[PDB]
Amino acid sequence: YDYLFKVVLIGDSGVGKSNLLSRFTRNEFNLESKSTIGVEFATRSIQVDGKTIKAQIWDTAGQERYRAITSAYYRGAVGALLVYDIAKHLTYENVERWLKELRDHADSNIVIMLVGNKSDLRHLRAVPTDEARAFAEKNGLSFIETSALDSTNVEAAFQTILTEIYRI
Numbered sequence: 001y002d003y004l005f006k007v008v009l010i011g012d013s014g015v016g017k018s019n020l021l022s023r024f025t026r027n028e029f030n031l032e033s034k035s036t037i038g039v040e041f042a043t044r045s046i047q048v049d050g051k052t053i054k055a056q057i058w059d060t061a062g063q064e065r066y067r068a069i070t071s072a073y074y075r076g077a078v079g080a081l082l083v084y085d086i087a088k089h090l091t092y093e094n095v096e097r098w099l100k101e102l103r104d105h106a107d108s109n110i111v112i113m114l115v116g117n118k119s120d121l122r123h124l125r126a127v128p129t130d131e132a133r134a135f136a137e138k139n140g141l142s143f144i145e146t147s148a149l150d151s152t153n154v155e156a157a158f159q160t161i162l163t164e165i166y167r168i
């Protein structure tokens, strides 16, 4: 590979972070996945502007009550996938909180992609696509909706953020 880019997954418990990771790196999905224990990471190489980018994707539980995610989790990260669940409005309301965590614990110029996951649950949607896109636009974030379940836009989400990082 030509470059190694560390990218972190963050977002509330249950939004689909671990399945976004497994879908992208192993093409695997699990309806019966449990809350993540400690910290995990996995890799996949992809082509970006004629270069081979080894994407090192980090993952951890969204809940931070007794245990808060430290600057060590974010160290070296050049991107963050900030994931919410399109069918749960609270997870979108908490995006502001995750942005604060990034400001507190992550690099100043970390590339942020706001990810509305579970787009296959369109019939249960609680967060309008236009509102989220507008919010992203107004806060200097990229935006995409994904479904780890049916694979829609998962490759595109990672390919796009890794492209934006490469092109900084």
Ligand SMILES: Nc1nc2c(ncn2[C@@H]2O[C@H](COP(=O)(O)OP(=O)(O)NP(=O)(O)O)[C@@H](O)[C@H]2O)c(=O)[nH]1
Pocket: 011, 012, 013, 014, 015, 016, 017, 018, 019, 020, 030, 031, 032, 033, 034, 035, 036, 060, 061, 062, 063, 117, 118, 119, 120, 121, 146, 147, 148, 149, 150
């Ligand atoms: N319908 C649907 N379900 C999904 C999707 N992505 C994940 N899920 C489901 O949502 C639940 C939680 O997914 P998971 O990946 O474990 O979430 P998490 O964000 O890693 N949770 P935690 O922060 O606690 O580790 C699981 O039942 C999983 O199968 C998706 O795109 N669509």
Ligand SMILES: [Mg+2]
Pocket: 017, 018, 019, 034, 035, 036, 059, 060, 061
């Ligand atoms: Mg998880």
